[PDB]
Amino acid sequence: ELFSNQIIWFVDDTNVYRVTYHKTFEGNLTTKPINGAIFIFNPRTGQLFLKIIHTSVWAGQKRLGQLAKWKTAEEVAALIRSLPVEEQPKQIIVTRKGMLDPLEVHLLDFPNIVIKGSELQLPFQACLKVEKFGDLILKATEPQMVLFNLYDDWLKTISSYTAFSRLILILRALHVNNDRAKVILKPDKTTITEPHHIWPTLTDEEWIKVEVQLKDLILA
Ligand SMILES: [Cl-]
Ligand SMILES: [Cl-]
Numbered sequence: 025e026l027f028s029n030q031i032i033w034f035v036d037d038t039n040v041y042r043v044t045y046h047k048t049f050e051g052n053l054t055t056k057p058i059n060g061a062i063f064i065f066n067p068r069t070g071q072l073f074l075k076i077i078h079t080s081v082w083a084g085q086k087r088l089g090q091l092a093k094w095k096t097a098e099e100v101a102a103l104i105r106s107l108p109v110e111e112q113p114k115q116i117i118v119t120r121k122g123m124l125d126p127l128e129v130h131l132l133d134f135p136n137i138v139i140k141g142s143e144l145q146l147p148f149q150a151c152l153k154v155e156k157f158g159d160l161i162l163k164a165t166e167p168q169m170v171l172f173n174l175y176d177d178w179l180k181t182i183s184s185y186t187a188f189s190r191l192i193l194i195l196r197a198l199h200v201n202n203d204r205a206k207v208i209l210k211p212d213k214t215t216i217t218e219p220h221h222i223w224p225t226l227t228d229e230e231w232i233k234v235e236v237q238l239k240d241l242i243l244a
């Protein structure tokens with residue numbers, strides 16, 4: 025499975041094609057695309073490749089929902105081609121089944137790479153309301169890739185499996201109730217997030233309490 029000898033990426037395409045709806049004064053529907061992102065995530069190291077997708081790519085094109093899956097597959101292949109072979113993933117796990125065929129067709133030059141689907145709940149969409157990603161995506165004027173470390177300094181003291189489990193609880197809790205999750209994640213008036221970190225600096229005891237509360241929020 026995960027946390028072995030091989031490089032694994034999760035790929036989430038959920039947030040690539042995003043639109044806002046508006047009812048005009050004339051009573052018609054406008055559907056305006058807004059910038060999206062592909063999340064490509066290494067659960068062992070915490071590395072996130074955030075590929076920001078600028079609305080220009082949609083041009084005057086149709087069925088943008090299906091096309092978006094192909095755009096995602098194109099970008100994953102482009103990233104793989106830009107990496108030395110030793111940094112290429114051995115397995116790619118797609119969070120949505122619609123990515124299986126587009127990725128299969130785009131990765132035919134990489135017979136070493138195993139593609140599979142998943143039933144895991146890994147809502148990277150929660151990141152769109154984490155200010156550090158949200159504004160970056162909103163304000164982009166062209167496509168670009170940005171690297172992050174989603175585990176902050178956790179791996180100094182906990183294993184990759186432990187870090188992944190904490191991250192998933194954070195994302196799922198933010199997804200199900202953003203406002204309440206943010207309160208849970210700020211236990212003290214003194215609680216801060218370092219400028220180069222994504223998540224707060226909490227004591228070991230604070231994390232125990234937070235992990236239980238996040239889980240309960242998800243169960244609710
Ligand atoms: Cl799908
Ligand atoms: Cl890019």
Ligand SMILES: [Mg+2]
């Ligand atoms: Mg390395």
